């Protein structure tokens, strides 16, 4: 039938130890980076690619949720597929009910709720992924970071996964509010390039952009072009 | 609507008219009333065309799961038991009739009748609203042991007769011959329907 009691209990210090551990799991995930320009948002995440046998074009970490929203994660993959399908479900309910593209702050509120429901339900562990949701509407960029604990932060530019501390310190000195989109992408790819360890290629780093035209993935040709000049 | 099936040695032959009428004006003057349930099991629809379609699709689903799970082509008796169950379980809600026919290694050609949710193998199992006008012809012209061409020209004649008299039936006559080789889908255009006494 399944366990009905919560598996996450307040430790005697009061800090939810399972969410500490889950955050440690995301902290070990593959590095990801997001930065918000003036007209859009960039998403670029490192492919921890094993043997060349892999069909790299088979699956992507940066999946669109509608015509104007993206996702990148850091940590456990299959859990991420769970949150992607759930998000697509939510945005579709919103589109049926109100006949409008779901504002990204809303979608991050709901998906944040779904990430919260499992820190408390019966016999399920919290997720192990920290989402980066970038979205555009009302002529404005959005970039949120959801964690296993369910809380979401609105960011100018952020980093997560392996070495996320040095990533964030790398962004503090290199993000400026008036950064156009392409130079933003340059800054992110440099950010990953700080601790890539493996000589990035157009196969092993993904790049996503959300602007007024909508969200999409940059094909490895274009990402190869941005991998020029670095 | 006049669908018809016949049993001969190597397989069957499922003729069927090609009109679906809405009251007194027709909606579709070409409509294949023979939807495959497997590679070699066709069901001739009739009655509520929507209902018959839903039954053909659900039956195709179960027959495909059961098909793969055994790893062997599902016997026609299996198919007419699932279409028989789905036609009997809903008999107050479906005005459907499905002369499910086909071939199978263990028995050869078969034509099961499933009006109202019953199951009865028969030599020739004609159905449809126009079928009430060809009982005379089929009874007078059916001789057991028909070669395939005899079955095809036979059912073409019969459905031709039904088409000339019946208003619920018109258009072209589809014919498929199911045997161990495979299905041989054929069409009879209105210029080829064998002419009978017209007055």
């Amino acid at each position: 039938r399944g366990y009905s009691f919560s598996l996450t209990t307040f430790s005697p210090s009061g800090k939810l130890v399972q969410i500490e551990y889950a955050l440690a799991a995301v902290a070990g995930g593959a590095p990801s980076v997001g930065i918000k320009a003036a007209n859009g948002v960039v998403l670029a995440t490192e492919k921890k690619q094993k043997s060349i046998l892999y069909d790299e074009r088979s699956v992507h970490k940066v999946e669109p949720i509608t015509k104007h929203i993206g996702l990148v994660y850091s940590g456990m993959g299959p859990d991420y597929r769970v949150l992607v399908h759930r998000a697509r479900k939510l945005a579709q309910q919103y589109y049926l009910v109100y006949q409008e593209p779901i504002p990204t702050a809303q979608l991050v509120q709901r998906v944040a709720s779904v990430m919260q429901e499992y820190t408390q339900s019966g016999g399920v562990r919290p997720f192990g992924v920290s989402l980066l949701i970038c979205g555009w509407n009302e002529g404005r960029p959005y970039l949120f970071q959801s964690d296993p604990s369910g809380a979401y932060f609105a960011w100018k530019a952020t980093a997560m996964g392996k070495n996320y501390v040095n990533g964030k310190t790398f962004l503090e000195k290199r993000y400026n509010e008036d950064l156009e989109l392409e130079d933003a992408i340059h800054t992110a790819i440099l950010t990953l390039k700080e601790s890539f360890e493996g000589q990035m290629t157009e196969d092993n780093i993904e790049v996503g952009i959300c602007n007024e035209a909508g969200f999409r993935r940059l094909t490895p040709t274009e990402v190869k072009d941005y991998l020029a000049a670095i | 609507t006049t669908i018809m099936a016949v049993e001969f040695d190597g397989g069957v032959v499922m003729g069927s008219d090609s009109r679906v009428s809405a009251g007194e004006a027709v909606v579709n003057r070409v409509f294949d009333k023979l939807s495959p349930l497997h590679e070699r099991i066709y069901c001739a629809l009739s009655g509520s065309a929507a209902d018959a379609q839903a039954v053909a699709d659900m039956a195709a689903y179960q027959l495909e799961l059961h098909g793969i799970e055994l790893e062997e082509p599902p016997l026609v008796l299996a198919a007419a038991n699932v279409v028989r169950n789905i036609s009997y379980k809903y008999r107050e809600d479906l005005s459907a009739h499905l002369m499910v026919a086909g071939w199978d290694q263990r028995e050869g050609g078969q034509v099961y009748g499933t009006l109202g949710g019953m199951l009865t193998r028969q030599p020739f199992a004609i159905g449809g609203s126009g079928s009430t006008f060809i009982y005379g012809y089929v009874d007078a012209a059916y001789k057991p042991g028909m070669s395939p061409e005899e079955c095809r020209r036979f059912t073409t004649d019969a459905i031709a007769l039904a088409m000339s008299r019946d208003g619920s039936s018109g258009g072209v006559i589809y014919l498929v011959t199911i045997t161990a080789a495979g299905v041989d889908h054929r069409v009879i255009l209105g210029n080829e329907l064998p002419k009978f006494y017209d007055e």
Binding site: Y3, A22, I52, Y54, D55, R81, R125 | I68
Partner: protein
């Protein structure tokens, strides 16, 4: 850290102090229980899956000791690890294909099939009551668009595209050799699979000790190569 463990992390699927799932990792330890090693590789024309076949008892009906499982008219399948779990994922995958065909009106692509099944193993790697199905299901199917497809889903829920792969005890040496050959490039493909697998095992297989599946662009229907044809490819290997 470094193998740290606290509470019930070593008993169910909850994050240890490091962030690992000891039950999933142990499940990967559990695919090595079957004592087998399977391989699938794909060239431009077809995707081939070759496996061991250990019939030691001699009373085993050799027709039923098989890790190939026709998923649809166009989708191959090779299990590995624990047996009965593999049987179960085969039933569930077949049900997925029939349901995709019923609801959506066409053949389920291999990517959506193996994606779906991975979604159904993740649920085990997240709920606490049932364990992960200890069996890495490999698929092979010919999509009309992208061509030969080989996807590997495991107890961890992962899956990905492959130009070659292998599952079982000798996944390491298998993948090593397949590195060493893919870096050196596919028509025969089968010669590659049997050469690799026989290499990492170093057996010089007999035509009855293995099995072969192929799905070609010219022939979408998944199919099994008999011991006679596997005898053909083997003897075609010895005579060079």
């Amino acid at each position: 850290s470094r193998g740290s463990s606290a509470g019930f992390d070593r008993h169910i699927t909850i994050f240890s102090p490091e962030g690992r799932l000891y039950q999933v990792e142990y499940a990967f330890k559990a695919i090595n229980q079957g004592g087998l090693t399977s391989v699938a590789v794909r060239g431009k024309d077809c995707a081939v899956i070759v496996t061991q076949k250990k019939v030691p008892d001699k009373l085993l009906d050799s027709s039923t000791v098989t890790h190939l499982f026709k998923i649809t008219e166009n989708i191959g399948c090779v299990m590995t690890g624990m047996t009965a779990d593999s049987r179960s994922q085969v039933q569930r995958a077949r049900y997925e294909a029939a349901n995709w065909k019923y609801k959506y009106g066409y053949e389920i692509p291999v990517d959506m099939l193996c994606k779906r099944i991975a979604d159904i193993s993740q649920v085990y790697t997240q709920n606490a009551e049932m364990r992960p199905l200890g069996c890495c299901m490999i698929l092979i199917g010919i999509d009309e668009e992208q061509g030969p497809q080989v996807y590997k889903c495991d107890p961890a829920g992962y899956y990905c595209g492959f130009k070659a792969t292998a599952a079982g005890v000798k996944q390491t040496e298998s993948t090593s050799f397949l590195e060493k050959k893919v870096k050196k490039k596919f028509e025969q493909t089968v010669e590659t699979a049997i050469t690799c697998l026989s290499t990492v095992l170093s057996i010089d297989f007999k035509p009855s000790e293995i099995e072969v599946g192929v799905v070609t662009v010219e022939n979408p229907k998944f199919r099994i190569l008999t011991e006679a044809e596997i005898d053909a490819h083997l003897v075609a290997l010895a005579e060079r």
